[PDB]
Design a protein around this ligand. Structure first.
Ligand SMILES: NC(=O)C1=CN([C@@H]2O[C@H](COP(=O)(O)OP(=O)(O)OC[C@H]3O[C@@H](n4cnc5c(N)ncnc54)[C@H](O)[C@@H]3O)[C@@H](O)[C@H]2O)C=CC1
Ligand SMILES: NC(=O)C1=CN([C@@H]2O[C@H](COP(=O)(O)OP(=O)(O)OC[C@H]3O[C@@H](n4cnc5c(N)ncnc54)[C@H](O)[C@@H]3O)[C@@H](O)[C@H]2O)C=CC1
Ligand SMILES: NC(=O)C1=CN([C@@H]2O[C@H](COP(=O)(O)OP(=O)(O)OC[C@H]3O[C@@H](n4cnc5c(N)ncnc54)[C@H](O)[C@@H]3O)[C@@H](O)[C@H]2O)C=CC1
Lengths: 512, 525, 512
């Protein structure tokens, strides 16, 4: 399955694609009298896409032994080796359901009858398959991924047994454990640490040698498997936000300096990031903690390395943001929105401590911002909202989410909508992780020039669709509208092969 | 093993039998035309006799042995009896009988030396048969062995089915009676294990008396092949369509029996199994909503003096509904609407997908609230209205397997124009709930067959002689959706009251008064 | 409507009822081998019921201007004067729906066809009607009850307007305001206080003169309306628990002493209680705070005054306790139970502060205690449970409660039940308040003697049905089983008129 567009905007040379693209947009200024003055703008670009993709992509997950880590590895092996498994519904064939890059489609255009024609998401331009992922990584616990699977209780027992022989071979590398940064109850789980002093004890001293050991782990992984490309992704327990203070982590020199000075504002994630950046490998932060402090972002630009992150956009927040937008697009005013989530995994176990959850408890202000017709000082520009996460160990990885929306309708009416969501959290997070790795790898092969080619700006915004707290560029505010986060990705892929943005005008039908 | 020894002078033991005196109190009421209630207390002493020697093995014959419930029942018995632990994603699980009131619930025996309540197993008071001692068999219009049945049902954990594979593979259903018009047309291709075949081996609704005699011999054969003394038969097969009751047809014992002989078209397979069990003196329990117990049949039960009971297993949805509607009315709240929707993807919801099958169901799943309304004329009367909109919907959605999804919306009125909206959403493997319920019914039925009594004349020692429970075992209503009643008496669906009756019954047999919840040891100095 | 029982257990003399009652029960002792030895016990009693009930009952509500207070007053006037009102569903007739004493029935026995015969709950023995309630009380805010109704937004606007003329006449008396005891945000609401110093400022000094002013308010109310009987009920913002320390509030002398010593462990509720006790008027605590400290209980016994309380059993906790018990009675093991409630009234506004909510966040251990078959060390004698209350002002008094039960079924199965409850909290609390006042008044006319008559033991346990945290007697643990809390009341009324406890045996049907 492949796509071939006949357009003069695209030319190939040496397994390299050059595409011309005129980007339009507009600048608006609301005059005093409330009049909107709009001046269209246009910037011409040329994109270069290295068509040669890695035959094998290296993946190093921090928190490799967790729910997401073990499920990620199981999914790759299960599909790669077509491991069909037994269930009470009979034999099931492995697949990557839940993955946008592997299981969603896009509209390329219309056929001769005037009907939409769809194509696989990853069929327009070359993308690496999760089947060619080589996975390794770190974890403060040394259990092999088979034991990690058993511990997670995420996958069908029979599938676990069919992957037992292969998963047992995979074992996480020791990692960096700074106790003060996570939930204290994660203290006896840590039996796999590199940061130990002469008395064989865990220390936060020698942070630079810790950073150097991570770089070594990455180099070794690459060499040991003969891989050219590697991507690192954090999927470990949420850390407590670090304080961004001047002189400490505001510049890449201070940051690198603080790391050598064993500063207390340097968290483990801070070191895995600085270590990946220095090795030139893309780094994805899948947790809410503010790993990407200023200093770290500088070091990323300077090295021209791709970073991205801030939480693995839960499937509830994802969907909850969609409905909310749906209502406001319909002229309906949600005046209240209550969210209640409870899970029984370690993830929920680590969020128990308010320090870990406070990072998570961090989109509604954007929707309410989009509509001043319903939200203003005369009517009430406010929306009550609450986010409660509770740890109910008996529900395991199978989380339960509930959202209640109370909105006002016309003439005193009201509307109450309740969303009850139940599913194994990891079966939604894993595929998200796959999509992130696939698209990060894809973007590293893309360069642009306004009209010498520059890298596709380190902070990969197209990846906001899969991250609850979209990282941003100084000054610009993030946009969480999920449909728009996928519309961005979709149009980007389209513009790379000479196709315009979707307009949905269907003039072949609407007009004579 | 846990046991209970009540030091009372109301109980005496004689040759494997417990004799218990009990003074039953009640009161008759009349309401003066004007509006007063004249209440006359009543009393009637009894001496109950409980046969303590319970059967070492109890025969169980299920009609629908290869269905979701029959399948799971045998599996639960085998798994528990042999302690067949199994693997799941939550690890190794030990078998158990959760969901079984008889096996996993407790009863308060009293208070301790310090005033704190003391409970004991429901089955620890008096000798009851353990489901682990069930010797199960039965009939089914389909010949799949019970392992295939398990596979097809998709109720139990794959690993468990596998560990039960060898044993369950050897369990094969006896051929049954298939009368095409009594069930959904889709079960058509499923019937390949019938006894009613004509010269050229085709399905035939002719020779129904021969069929009755075959079923009876089946019961006899089963019994002797297992060296069993006791046997209970329980219908857990497809839901049949209601059969019309007509004078001279099935209105009397004699009429019914002849009709069976005449191959009357109002004689359903269940009618024959019911009649056969009754003639064999085997307790028969109807676990489906169809009106199997027509007058003539009940009459035959009464004449033969054989236990019958039933009409639909009290689903976890209709159970919880009775508990919640009762609760609201007991609190003075007025339900004015109760919407109950639900969908399943098993053969149960597939056979119910037909309007005539769903009809039986919709009759039993509804009536469960008629008595609730009748008890409160303060709320329900001619002024305020005494109606309660109640609709029941059962949709078939194959993709959900045995897992049923029940949703109930209660809209009630509160004071001064206010309203209350309660929504109950229920998800579970419907069959993991029904199975222990089937176990409860069989354990209690068996227990009852060992109970006899006699009225005691206060002014004349040892009058009369011991009798058995009136044939219709209303004591089993706790587990049935549409409680079968005695002519004249209305059914009571109050779940909590249904269990209380059972509780107090067991309590009295060991000389304990009914629970009063007065707790004067603390409420009074 | 009335009931007349023909029994020799009952004799009337001078509008006085004497009833004989043999109370049976049993003492159990589980021998080492796990054998239960049971010895039945029996105690004979004679109850005296003063058949002469007050023609008018005085009611003084602390927090008279709140949601419950104003709705209580509106309900009495609406029904008493048959104020029919307009709604979009048409004209509605006032009623006391939700009240057990006014709208529930009981089974007296069976008729001649063998069918149950029911009678009104308050038709067996004389009970005072809420229509003969004379209501007054205190509140830190001085708004009249008409303004209080508008503020509560609990009742149909049209009904509010039809009661406007009468409700405006009712105004709350100034009350005792000790800032440190409630949610700080209740600081500008307090414009009606008696505890003011010479500089006209609010003080916590002079607590004894405060107590004396309450007694005066009660005496005046009684005299001013020519009432013999009065009952006081607390329905004000939840207070923060006070610390029970020896020498301060462990005895009635220390307590009375501490009150004079302006001790910080003496809360406003503590004073309204001690003041009602001294005036010999029954005192009901409708909030979770521990008002009834030791000392206060002594003073109650010594004066032989009836007290009772500890939260107005929310309709959710009520029902949530019923389902939970239903499951455990069925042999089903709830292994997890999550509760999430959010409201927009002042009540929820006051619970915002963890100090107020902590009192509320205080039954599952009893159910789990009843069944060691499912709950033991081999299986797991634990049930995860959580209680979350959030303040969502837009939902107003119309609270939303959600309970999720996750239970284990046989052979690895599970059952998940979700209960979504929506209603105006006050429309459920008001009638509960009515039932409490009616039954407290009823019990004050009941005396007993084992076989000189003693008062129906101060701590009225029969009232646990309407109180989330049933107050108790030293040593005895409370029982919250709602059906059993109503079975107690029901049988008590029955035993007073010579009828035995319900057995549900129906031998007229089951036996030949
Ligand atoms: N649970 C889920 O399915 C989803 C999780 N997320 C996010 O992804 C993160 C991981 O979630 P899960 O895999 O489920 O949780 P988990 O708790 O099972 O896995 C985290 C793993 O991180 C390891 N770990 C902790 N600190 C470490 C360190 N300093 N170095 C290396 N390893 C370390 C732990 O030992 C554990 O095995 C969460 O913090 C959350 O932000 C978002 C959506 C869904
Ligand atoms: N499955 C559940 O959770 C509950 C079931 N029930 C009732 O219990 C009954 C059985 O339910 P399931 O086991 O789930 O259904 P099922 O459809 O899986 O099993 C019924 C079995 O009966 C057999 N059968 C049908 N007509 C027969 C006849 N004349 N003679 C012998 N066998 C016959 C069928 O071939 C099938 O194997 C139904 O009537 C249903 O309404 C009620 C409450 C819950
Ligand atoms: N909101 C409801 O409908 C129900 C309330 N409850 C309970 O009843 C209590 C009252 O609830 P609502 O009437 O709804 O709340 P509310 O906040 O509307 O009414 C409480 C009233 O107490 C007054 N107040 C506070 N401290 C006082 C003091 N020291 N002296 C005199 N007045 C004082 C306040 O000014 C307010 O008017 C709650 O604390 C809660 O424990 C329980 C179930 C339902």
């Amino acid at each position: 399955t492949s796509v071939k567009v006949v357009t003069d905007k695209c030319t190939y040379k040496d397994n390299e694609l050059l595409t011309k693209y005129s980007y339009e947009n507009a600048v608006v200024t609301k005059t005093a009298s409330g009049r909107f003055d709009v001046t269209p703008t246009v910037q011409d670009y040329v994109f270069k896409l290295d068509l040669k993709k890695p035959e094998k992509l290296g993946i190093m997950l921090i928190g490799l032994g967790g729910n997401n880590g073990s499920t990620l590895v199981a999914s790759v092996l299960a599909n790669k080796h077509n491991v069909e498994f037994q269930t009470k519904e009979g034999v099931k064939q492995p697949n990557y359901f839940g993955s946008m890059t592997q299981c969603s489609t896009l509209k390329l255009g219309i056929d001769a009858e005037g009907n939409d024609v769809y194509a696989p998401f990853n069929s327009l331009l070359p993308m690496v398959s999760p089947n060619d992922f080589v996975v390794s990584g770190w974890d403060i616990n040394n259990a092999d991924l088979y034991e990690a699977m058993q511990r997670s209780q995420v996958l069908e027992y029979d599938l676990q047994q069919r992957l037992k022989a292969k998963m047992s071979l995979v074992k996480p590398l020791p990692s960096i454990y700074y106790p003060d940064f996570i939930a204290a109850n994660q203290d006896e789980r840590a039996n796999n640490c590199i940061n130990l002093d002469e008395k064989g004890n865990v220390t936060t001293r020698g942070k630079w040698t810790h950073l150097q050991r991570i770089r070594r782990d990455i180099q070794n992984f690459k060499e040991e498997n003969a891989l050219d490309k590697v991507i690192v992704l954090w999927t470990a327990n949420t850390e407590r936000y670090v304080e961004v203070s001047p002189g400490v982590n505001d510049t890449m020199e201070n940051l690198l300096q603080s790391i050598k000075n064993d500063h207390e504002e340097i968290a483990p994630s801070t070191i895995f990031a600085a270590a990946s950046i220095l090795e030139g490998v893309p780094y994805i932060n899948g947790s809410p903690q503010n790993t990407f402090v200023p200093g770290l972002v500088q070091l990323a630009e300077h090295e021209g390395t791709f970073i991205a992150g801030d939480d693995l956009k839960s499937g509830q927040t994802k969907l909850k943001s969609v409905l909310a937008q749906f209502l406001v697009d319909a002229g309906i005013k949600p005046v209240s929105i209550a969210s209640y989530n409870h899970l029984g995994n370690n993830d929920g176990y680590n969020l128990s401590a308010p320090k870990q959850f406070r990072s998570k408890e961090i989109v509604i202000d954007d929707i309410i911002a989009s509509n001043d017709i319903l939200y203003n000082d005369k009517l009430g520009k406010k929306v009550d909202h609450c986010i409660v996460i509770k740890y109910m160990k008996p529900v395991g990885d199978s989380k339960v989410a509930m959202d209640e929306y109370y909105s006002e309708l016309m003439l005193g009416g009201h509307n109450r909508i309740s969303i009850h969501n139940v599913c194994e959290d990891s079966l939604l997070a894993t595929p998200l992780i796959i999509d992130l790795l696939v698209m990060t790898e894809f973007c590293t092969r893309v360069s642009y020039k306004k009209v010498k080619f520059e890298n596709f700006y380190p902070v990969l915004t197209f990846l906001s669709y899969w991250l609850k707290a979209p990282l941003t560029r100084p000054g610009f505010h993030p946009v969480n509208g999920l449909n728009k986060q996928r519309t961005a990705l979709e149009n980007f892929l389209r513009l790379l092969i000479g196709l315009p943005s979707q307009n949905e005008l269907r003039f072949e039908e609407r007009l004579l």
